[PDB]
Please model this.
Amino acid sequence: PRPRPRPR
Amino acid sequence: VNPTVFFDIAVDGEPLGRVSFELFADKVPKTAENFRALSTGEKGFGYKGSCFHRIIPGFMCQGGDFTRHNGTGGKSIYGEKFEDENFILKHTGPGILSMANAGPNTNGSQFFICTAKTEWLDGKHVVFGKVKEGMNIVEAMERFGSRNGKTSKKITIADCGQL
Model:
């Protein structure tokens, strides 16, 4: 699970 | 004239404050209309009573999952999903309102409010509005987020509609 939006 | 919508935010049921938004119907009319209609509940469903399930301080506050309350649900006024309308508008700074998605042409009801410039999201998420009043209330909501986005208190849209 890597929900968007993704951070930077 | 671009529409204005508001959300009244509560924390564990305690009123926190109101956030209003300008919706850029002049540039993204289809996407602005979905958000506007979900805010008014005019189609018989929408944001009222839904929660901000993912809050990452210094990045964004995410909500709009009114069906599953955890990032895996939501739906638009057009169907379960609709296309990325355009990427005219960019993620320029705090207050930008933009669509969350699960890849291209997967917009439903989930949205995020930036609390920083997030330019890496340009051309991947549809920008459709900004905060107009109550950015301080969005800033207060970050008090209940975490690096991984799990909230430490229940953050809800107690009321919403059009101004």
